[PDB]
Amino acid sequence: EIPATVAAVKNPSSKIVYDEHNHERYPPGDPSKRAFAYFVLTGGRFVYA
Amino acid sequence: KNPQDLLLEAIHSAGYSGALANPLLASESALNGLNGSILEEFVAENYTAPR
Amino acid sequence: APPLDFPLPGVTLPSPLPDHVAPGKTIVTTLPNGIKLASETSAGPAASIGLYVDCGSIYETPLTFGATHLLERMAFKSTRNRTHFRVVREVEAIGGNVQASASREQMGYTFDALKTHVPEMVELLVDCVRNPVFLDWEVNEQLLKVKAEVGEASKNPQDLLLEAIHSAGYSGALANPLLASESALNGLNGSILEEFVAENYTAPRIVLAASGVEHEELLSIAEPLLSDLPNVPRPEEPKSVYTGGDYRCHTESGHILNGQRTHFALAFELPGGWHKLKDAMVLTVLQMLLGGGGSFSAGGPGKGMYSRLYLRVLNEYPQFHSISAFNNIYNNTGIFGIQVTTGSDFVSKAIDITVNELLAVATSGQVDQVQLDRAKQATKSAILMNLESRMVVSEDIGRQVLTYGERKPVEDFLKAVDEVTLKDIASISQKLISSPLTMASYGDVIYVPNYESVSSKFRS
Amino acid sequence: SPPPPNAMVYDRLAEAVKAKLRQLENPDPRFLKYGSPRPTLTDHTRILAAPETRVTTLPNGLRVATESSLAARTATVGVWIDAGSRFETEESNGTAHFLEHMIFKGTEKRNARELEEEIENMGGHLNAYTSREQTTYYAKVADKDVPKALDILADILQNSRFDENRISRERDVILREMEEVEGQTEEVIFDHLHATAFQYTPLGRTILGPAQNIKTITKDHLQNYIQTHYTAPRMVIAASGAVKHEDIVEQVKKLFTKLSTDPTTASQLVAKEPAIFTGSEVRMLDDEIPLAQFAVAFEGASWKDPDSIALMVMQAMLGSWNKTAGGGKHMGSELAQRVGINEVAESMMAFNTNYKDTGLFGVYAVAKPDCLDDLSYAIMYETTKLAYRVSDDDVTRARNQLKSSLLLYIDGTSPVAEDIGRQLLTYGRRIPFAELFARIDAVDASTIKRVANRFIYDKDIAIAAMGPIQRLPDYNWFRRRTYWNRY
Amino acid sequence: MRNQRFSLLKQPISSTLNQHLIDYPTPSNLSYWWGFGSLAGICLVIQIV
Amino acid sequence: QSFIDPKKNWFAAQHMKAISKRLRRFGLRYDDLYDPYYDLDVKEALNRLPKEVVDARHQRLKRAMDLSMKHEYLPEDLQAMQTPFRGYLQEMLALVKREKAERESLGGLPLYQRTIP
Ligand SMILES: [Zn+2]
């Protein structure tokens, strides 16, 4: 029985699973939501001014 | 800093073959295989009533 | 700009070279002060210029020990005309590469850039070798790196041994160590290096060698800058004798517990090394004939998979992990031997399995004539493939006008490998074992034999 | 009664420092005539002549390219294939590397010992290497054994046998080759970087494959790989040295007659399974290791992209510093001056990889665990500055260095032939030396900022780290510093 | 110290603010009940102004 | 220029002996007044000097901080043995400043920077 952290440095698999209890992921092959994330943060920086 | 027990140990390894060539003050690698259970059963075997 | 599968429109294209460009011949010129400029053209777009000096690690009296391992680290630094910041920025401005190396008999400084930059490449190379100031704050920061690498040299046990088959074995100059110890790094400063160079870097000991430069260009640049060095008498060459010797060092006290293993080696001697030309080419054939390797390297058809030390040692004794021959030829003496690692519980017979093989080639019938032809084909091609680089070519014009005063054509090297027969392999290897046995060891030293236990198994 | 200036040891040790400094004051103007520390841009047209590269396409689709140099005494000839690890299916993931080691062992005409002896009797060599998209088999011989060398490469690529006694003895050579490349730590960083940047794509897999795949692979699989991929439109025969073009063409027209005939090209296989970049990270913490290693990467350009030449000029601006180097504190690159002056790393290196559809651009570094904050600040500060503020001496020096390093590398018969064979597979042609120099100096300070704004500015990154890395900053620290909230 | 400068928040003029208000190490599972302490320092500034 | 040379001017040969008089009573040289905390270039010129020359500077500075705590001067036997204006620092400091003016005209980061207080 190999340690779990030892058997993960020896096998670089390209199928990674994250924790999906709080956030679901956009499926691979989608654009980034960077422009939407800027315009929500502007309409509150309007308010603090 | 004691070159008369450096030499007196070196006239002992070079010169004998078996038991009398075992060093008295040991080196760095045999201090890494030693622990409290090596000392414990070395004494339970070699410290007996006829000795 | 178009994508890279479509050609760009508006560019001039040079007209190509023919399919058979005739090769050039080496031109050598001797100046009145004794310096020798040597040039040869080529068919690439790049040049390679080097400067080679006769000095080395055998000219080291006991006041200047370690003073050529440090001259390799002080190489392209502050001069009387340029700071160390201007030297680094001038080499990077043209995209060059600069390098130095030190031997027991030769020092060498090299440069290579494109052929457009030949007048720049020459005057930086001459100024960095002819006019070094040695400033104490630059020397002290190079000493502190040599002191932190003599802290550990125990991770290369084939130059630990190869230096230990040289001190034990010689007496005078050839026993001077190349990479020095901790105490001779404490007597060294910027004035020891300064007068070691003003004494040992003279005009009859300097050769400039170019590869890819026309000979009349190299004289318009390098002559007005080297002609006024003074003509001095050369010194007398340092002498030594080949005695025998034994050496052993039980390894540093942390290397074992299923760890150090074993590293031993043997050696011999043969009086001339390069001024007796006929004998040295026999021994290079005998090196590829014996050969061998570490055998867990996985290349291909190639290096040594059908040598004597391969299919008669490692192919049936799996306890070996390395066995190979080695030659260290110099200018009059020479050294031939065999380096082995094995296990600690499999050691003393590995001296046995080693020695017979040196006894097998001393016999006149054990070697085939199908084994001799393989070692003479694998030797002529190794010389020919290695000479394709422009850097090996310039290094050949340097170290041959320091030994013969002229460059020997490569046709005379392929002519004299043809002549070797099955009896020259036997006679010179019988003149090899007539000299005392040099032995060295490292690792677990306790389980090995001693000098006279082995040396009387040969002759004397 | 003042002491004379030789009487005290400290007074006459000070007249010897003033005499060492008076020989730094009178420079010789004949040693300063050609060299200059300011970079300029120059013309290299007179020296750029070369022999002619002749390409010939056979009617089955096979291409034969040569560069002849008839005054030499050696030659290099080999086969370049457009196939690799990307074109497998995760149940055959180690196949193209296993087939490489099992191709010098077969051949009904010559067994393993006979093939090994024919090469060594001539005095030649025979190599092979695999990558994720390309395979090579080539040989270095003398000029009179070129027809024998080409006879062996055609027979081991067409008529190889794979027997079970040889297959199972190669399963223990490769399973021990895996174990030694688990301890190099530069091939381990760059292998976890590909698995996290190109996850759920075929470009993310490793070349050697999982260890369970290797003990399962049998001849069945080796033979469908060599009948699906090794076909005539995806193969290039390249020779360089003392060869003649018209004599090699007639040899390959009668030796290569029996390879397969599937009409699938490589571009139909890249387009139905493309490669997609993802911003993500992997961190492997151990704390018993003394040094830490990591790499941070942006997405880059493909092979035929016109912006590829500008991502090679930019890589020469970031530079490389090592602790043994003679440049020291005086290097051209400003990232190498930050690392070098403050001693915040052991070594630093910028990389740039190209592929058929994607690429990778970044920096790799090795350092001590208490230096990881000031090193990560300096790396991110100088990469983002390429999108804002580019000096003109920076690009002239980085253009002079890329011109010189691409040509100083082509030295001998084997660097020439791998230049021909690899460029016919990626560009479809060999680019002459005068066009390639003309595309390099068309990259000025305004071109740098425009490609930096496309690839670097406000973009996702991928990180892989290993060692005592508890003091390396986290992902939100790195992602924020891809832009400057100050200009 | 180092030999030349770096991030300006690691300078002596802003070290006491960096190591106590920006880079200060905090347990990662703190809930919203750990928020009423900075809220009480805002209520004290409102009363003074 | 022309108003500072004391062997041509008369009011510069009286400004010269006024500082020479005041330096002898503490046994100081004019270069001991250069502080490595005022100018970071003075810190570098002192690291390139031999250890025996910097050690005599640290001992002249300690002898003088002891004379001013006690409110006294050197005795006039020791005052005739003093050499102010015998320098050890000006040539090495001009070299460090000349190397810094070359690293700025050619691009290149500074080798040492001042900490911001
Ligand atoms: Zn392999």
Distance CA C61, CA C58 (A): 8
CA of C192 from ligand 1 middle (Å) equals 51
Nearest residue to C298 via CA among D68, E35, D97: D97
Closest-CA residue in chain D for C74? D326
Mutate to test the interface with D, among E3, E6, E15 (most CBs of D within 10 A): E6
- The beta-carbon contacts of B5-14 under 8 Å, at least 24 apart in sequence, are none
Nearest residue to C240 via CA among C177, C171, C176, C178: C171
Q: Nearest CB to C85: which of F47, F50, F102?
A: F102
Could you tell me if C341 and C262 are in contact, meaning their C-beta atoms sit under 8 angstroms apart? Answer: yes
Chain D nearest-CA distance from C75, in A, is 9
| CA distances for D273 relative to D85, D320, F59, F101, angstroms | 14, 35, 78, 57
CA dihedral C13, C19, C22, C23 (to 10 degrees): 80
Mutate to test the interface with F, among D8, D11, D331, D333 (most CBs of F within 10 A): D11
State the greatest distance between any 2 C-alpha atoms of chain A, in Å, as a whole number: 60
State which amino acid sits at residue D474.
Answer: D
Distance CA C354, CA C454 (A): 11
State in Å, rounded, how far the first CA of chain C is from the last one. 77
Q: C212: alpha, beta or left, given left = phi > 0 and alpha = psi -120 to 50? A: left
Could you tell me if D231 and D62 are in contact, meaning their C-beta atoms sit under 8 angstroms apart? Answer: no
Per DSSP, helices labelled H in C291-335 are: 308-309
Distance CA F18, CA F1 (A): 20
Which residues from chain E sit within 8 angstroms of residue D379, using beta carbons? none
Distance CA C66, CA C177 (A): 8
CA of C296 from ligand 1 middle (Å) equals 12
In sequence order, what DSSP letters do the residues of D127-178 get, joined into one string?
EEEE-SS-EEEEEEEETTSHHHHHHHHHHHTTS----HHHHHHHHHHHHHHH
- Secondary structure tally for chain D: helices H, strands E: 19, 12
Q: Which residues of D19-55 are buried (b: 16+ CB within 10 A; e: fewer)?
A: ebbeebeeeeeebeeebebebeeeebeebbebbebeb
In sequence order, what DSSP letters do the residues of C58-116 get, joined into one string?
TS--TTSTTTTTTTTTSTT--BSS--HHHHHHHHHTTT-EEEEEE-SS-EEEEEE-BGG
Contact state of D199 with A28 under an 8 Å Cβ cutoff: yes
Specify the DSSP element, H or E, that contains D364: strand D359-367
Evaluate whether chains A and F are touching (3 or more beta carbon pairs less than 8 Å apart).
no
Distance CA C248, CA C443 (A): 9
Nearest residue to C438 via CA among C270, C282, C312, C291: C270
Could you tell me if C412 and C280 are in contact, meaning their C-beta atoms sit under 8 angstroms apart? Answer: no
Task: Pull the structure tokens for residue C80.
Answer: 């009387």
Breakpoints of chain B, after residues (C–N > 2.5 Å): none
Q: Is C298 exposed, middle or buried (0-12, 13-18, 19+ CB in 10 A)?
A: exposed
D23 CB within 8 Å of a chain C CB: yes
Mutate to test the interface with C, among D17, D28, D34 (most CBs of C within 10 A): D34
Please check if D101 is assigned to a binding site. Answer: yes
Collapsing DSSP states into helix, strand and coil, what is residue C24? coil
Q: Which residues of F72-102 are buried (b: 16+ CB within 10 A; e: fewer)?
A: eebeeeeeeebebeeebbebbbebbeeeeee
Distance CA A12, CA D86 (A): 15
Cβ neighbours, 10 Å, residue D283: 16
State which amino acid sits at residue C365.
Answer: G
Catalytic (active-site) positions of D: 100, 170
CA of D97 from ligand 1 middle (Å) equals 6
Nearest residue to D274 via CA among D182, D337, D179, D355: D355
Task: Pull the structure tokens for residue D64.
Answer: 């034969």
CA C24 to chain centre: 27
Q: Are strands D125-130 and D135-142 parallel, antiparallel or unpaired?
A: antiparallel
Phi, psi of C295 (to 5 degrees): 70, -5
In sequence order, what DSSP letters do the residues of F74-105 get, joined into one string?
--TTGGGG--TT--SSHHHHHHHHHHHHHHHH
Please check if E34 is assigned to a binding site. Answer: yes
Nearest residue to C248 via CA among C437, C104, C449: C449
Distance CA D95, CA D451 (A): 38
Residue pairs between chains A and D whose CB atoms are closer than 8 Å = 40
Angle, helices D372-384/D334-342, rounded to nearest 10 degrees: 160
Distance CA C46, CA C391 (A): 10
Residue B38: partners with Cβ closer than 8 Å, 6 or more residues away? none
Distance CA C339, CA C20 (A): 45
Angle, helices D392-407/D308-318, rounded to nearest 10 degrees: 110
Could you tell me if C72 and C235 are in contact, meaning their C-beta atoms sit under 8 angstroms apart? Answer: no
Collapsing DSSP states into helix, strand and coil, what is residue C124? helix
Collapsing DSSP states into helix, strand and coil, what is residue D342? helix
Q: Nearest CB to C85: which of F47, F48, F103?
A: F103
Distance CA D376, CA D338 (A): 11
State whether the Cα torsion D62-D67-D72-D76 is positive or negative: negative
Strand D63-68: give its sheet, edge to edge: D53-57, D63-68, D235-241, D74-81, D135-142, D125-130
CA D82 to chain centre: 17
Resolution (A): 2.7
Which runs of E-coded beta strand occur in F11-90?
Answer: none
Nearest residue to D317 via CA among B9, F107, C225: F107
Distance CA D155, CA D251 (A): 13
Cβ neighbours, 10 Å, residue C411: 8
